[PDB]
């Protein structure tokens, strides 16, 4: 088998469930139900993802953060997120300083996929703040998120502007050409629609129809090749031997 | 004689507004450190034949774009309060001659489509401003809704309007199409023979003026066309009524 351990922050309504079950071929979220305003916080959420392929089967588990960004005053909503993931971090150190510690689990938070609003400015304050207070706890992963709102010179001038903002403000993403389009602007849809003689999957307006698949319409395919398992592996490596041993290093050394 | 309107903006960065007030004129005319709501305005006279418009913008940047929203309503409220109270105060003067008229007439507020419903802050600022100014309620960017999601995300926000019993301005006939769904663009690409203003993606164009993929078009006529004197007349015989009962009874 194999494990992982994928973090989802972004707006509400920014296609993160749709992405998820487009990543992953699941149907995993349920619909917004009934009644109206009682103000919002970060909520940690897990659901265990158990895929099965005939002997090679992912474990993977998705850490969901309903709330993020949601309220009229998101001060400090962050937090949750640090304190979530800082906690893994703990128990994984008191885990193995243990005399006897052969079981060891580790729930670390191996990737977090961070969605930007398609805007077609900047960033967010919200997102400057999230991804500086972040970047060196967990590999982050930034999204454009619903794409298909972006015409390509609209995005690719998007692209521009966030990258010169995460250099501007020091922000270390997540590294593996790919990083020539970053960050990556995604859509989904786990709806098939024929396009000419061709089921495919995506998005359908009276227009047309945004296709999930198609490299030249969303970079979804870019980023469903990043996670499977060998680029997973270097994601873990990454929560361990930098994110991991930085949090030890401090907590030890007081 | 001419016609003037001051016309108020509201909503996130990035929703396109700029976008849609230089499409109702067929014309483009604009366009780690905390944010507060300003209040800016500009002015835009339209001189065709011999009538003036002389419309007056009042936008709101900043407004919902901050980490920490708390009270950004307050200084588009402090805004529309003053010109009641200016008004008031002109009004009174024993010689009221020379009358300025600056009354917010009109408030378009862009929710951003989401998919879901109303963001808190959207029924936060609704709530609080739906007895001071006209707010027309306004999907952004409405091409990024198919249409089962606009239809479904329309009757959430009728819901929670209704839910938080919100008054939206009353348009004196496509009532059931609420809140208008728009587009922006004066982009122009030749769709089938036609040149039409809309967004071009690699699949297609969205159109502006196209009734079946936006309710642009309906906006426009609203606007443009003098319904602008219904806004005006429930600004003053409503609003502004009200406001300066409430003055004068706390004499
Ligand atoms: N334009 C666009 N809409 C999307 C995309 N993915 C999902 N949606 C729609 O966005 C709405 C909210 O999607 P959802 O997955 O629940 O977003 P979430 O709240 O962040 O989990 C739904 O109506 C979706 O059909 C996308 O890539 N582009
Ligand atoms: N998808 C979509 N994008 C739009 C629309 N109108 C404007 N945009 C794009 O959204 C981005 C921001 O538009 P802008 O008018 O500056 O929004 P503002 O900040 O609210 O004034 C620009 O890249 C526009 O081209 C629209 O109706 N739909
Ligand atoms: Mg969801
Ligand atoms: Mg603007």
């Known amino acids: 088998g194999f494990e992982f351990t994928l973090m989802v922050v972004g707006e509400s309504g920014l296609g993160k469930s749709t992405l998820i079950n487009s990543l992953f071929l699941t149907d995993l979220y349920s619909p917004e139900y009934p009644?109206?305003?009682?103000?919002?916080?970060?909520?940690?959420?897990?659901?265990?993802?158990?895929?099965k392929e005939g002997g090679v089967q992912l474990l993977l588990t998705i850490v969901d953060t309903p709330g993020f960004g949601d309220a009229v005053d998101n001060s400090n909503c962050w937090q949750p997120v640090i304190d979530?993931?800082?906690?893994?971090?703990?128990?994984?150190?008191?885990?193995?300083?243990?005399?006897?510690?052969?079981?060891?689990?580790?729930?670390?938070?191996?990737?977090?996929?961070y969605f930007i609003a398609p805007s077609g400015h900047g960033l967010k304050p919200l997102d400057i703040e999230f991804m500086?207070?972040?970047?060196?706890?967990?590999?982050?992963?930034?999204?454009?998120?619903?794409?298909?709102?972006?015409?390509?010179?609209?995005?690719?001038?998007?692209?521009?502007?966030?990258?010169?903002?995460?250099?501007?403000?020091?922000?270390?993403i997540y590294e593996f050409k790919?990083?020539?389009?970053?960050?990556?602007?995604?859509?989904?849809?786990?709806?098939?629609?024929e396009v000419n003689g061709k089921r495919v999957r995506g998005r359908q307006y009276p227009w047309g129809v945004a296709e999930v698949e198609n490299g030249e319409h969303c970079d979804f395919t870019i980023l469903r090749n990043m996670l499977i398992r060998t680029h997973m592996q270097d994601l873990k490596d990454v929560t361990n031997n930098v994110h991991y041993?930085?949090?030890?290093?401090?907590?030890?050394?007081a």
Do not use: W
């Not at 009644?35 to 158990?50: G, N």
């Not at 993931?85 to 990737?111: G, H, T, W």
């Not at 982050?140 to 010179?153: C, G, M, S």
């Not at 790919?178 to 629609?193: H, Q």
């Open 35 to 51: 009644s109206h305003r009682i103000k919002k916080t970060v909520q940690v959420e897990q659901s265990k993802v158990l895929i």
């Open 84 to 113: 979530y993931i800082d906690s893994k971090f703990e128990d994984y150190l008191n885990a193995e300083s243990r005399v006897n510690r052969r079981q060891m689990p580790d729930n670390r938070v191996q990737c977090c996929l």
């Open 132 to 172: 500086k207070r972040l970047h060196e706890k967990v590999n982050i992963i930034p999204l454009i998120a619903k794409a298909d709102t972006l015409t390509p010179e609209e995005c690719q001038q998007f692209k521009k502007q966030i990258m010169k903002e995460i250099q501007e403000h020091k922000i270390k």
């Open 178 to 193: 790919i990083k020539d389009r970053l960050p990556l602007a995604v859509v989904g849809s786990n709806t098939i629609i």
């Open 245 to 253: 041993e930085n949090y030890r290093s401090r907590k030890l050394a």
